[PDB]
Design a protein around this ligand. Sequence first.
Ligand SMILES: Nc1ncnc2c1ncn2[C@@H]1O[C@H](CSCC[C@H](N)C(=O)O)[C@@H](O)[C@H]1O
Ligand SMILES: [Ca+2]
Ligand code: NA
Ligand code: NA
Length: 375
Amino acid sequence: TPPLATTIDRLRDYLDRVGFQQIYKYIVAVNHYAVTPALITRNTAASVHHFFDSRLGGRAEFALLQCLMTGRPAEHAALPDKDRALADALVTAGLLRASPDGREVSGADRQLISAFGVDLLIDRRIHFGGEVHEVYIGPASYWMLYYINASGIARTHRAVDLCTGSGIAALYLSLFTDHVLATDIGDVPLALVEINRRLNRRDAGTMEIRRENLNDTLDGRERFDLLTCNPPFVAFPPGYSGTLYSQGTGVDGLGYMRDIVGRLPEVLNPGGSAYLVADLCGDAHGPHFLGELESMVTGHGMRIEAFIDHVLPASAQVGPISDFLRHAAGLPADTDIAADVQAFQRETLRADYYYLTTIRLQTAAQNPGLRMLRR
Ligand SMILES: Nc1ncnc2c1ncn2[C@@H]1O[C@H](CSCC[C@H](N)C(=O)O)[C@@H](O)[C@H]1O
Ligand SMILES: [Ca+2]
Ligand code: NA
Ligand code: NA
């Protein structure tokens, strides 16, 4: 607890000493850095290792860094003296592993990335290995943040990142404002955002971390200038269990998006803005949910902009959904989940397509209206 805080401080010192963020940015390059967190994965790790070995010369100062980035083993005695004591502290914290004979250090369940200028530990199981992850991050996380107008954020603006997960959106907002609230209800994400807050030299002085249900924060009396939320939004067929980060509420998975949008006229200060993201079902003309938002244009004079950045036919999602459901619940391979998914997509969701959509909503707009951007 204080030992962990000191360990994260020393980790931060190591990342600074060897220029981690710059090395990550160089490896992935500027045309990929903000596209997706799934850049260093089990399918690219061999190439990452080759770069460290052949272009960075295998320098020992980068050995602990690779343990964190890909899980690659480093011989304990080969670590530089300062990095060796940090490695021991990370093993004690459960953030790296030691081999059974203690002669090397290697990856545990946390992967070190950089996103939007922040250093971030994420759940390594999303990009490596074969066990279902407990903390989500994905391209939807990134595209939510991409559309934020950072130059319009004042130091005194009050911002909230609901359903914060790893903390990425809250930490991004903390680059610009000194008043950030980050919320979640999962034990595992809450422990991780606490680590990532400290990893970026923040504390409760400028970023509050709160265990609180989305609808409780939304009903509350606190008012915000800026809101971000990537909520659970996936609709799974009746009878199937997902995970805390994936399964949306309501008949079509969008209950949490409805909850948020409905309270924006009250929770945002006049002229404040919210950024949401979801993979929205729709027909050939667009996502069904945008039709529900005309009530916010007419009823509350908001401006609402929807940025559609990925389109897939519903049939292309049947496999990924069924695979996720099978793996999350440990179901056997003879269950016809795919037919259940198809039937649900067509009766309940009316989903011909899925549209990965970032939505910007502004209260008290001078130019109210709904705008849907498609390529
Ligand atoms: N009712 C609820 N109230 C608050 N958080 C919730 C919630 N239900 C699920 N969550 C949290 O919602 C998150 C959705 S995943 C989004 C994580 C992060 N904001 C990102 O963009 O990458 C998960 O971390 C999950 O624990
Ligand atoms: Ca590369
Ligand atoms: Na490897
Ligand atoms: Na989500």
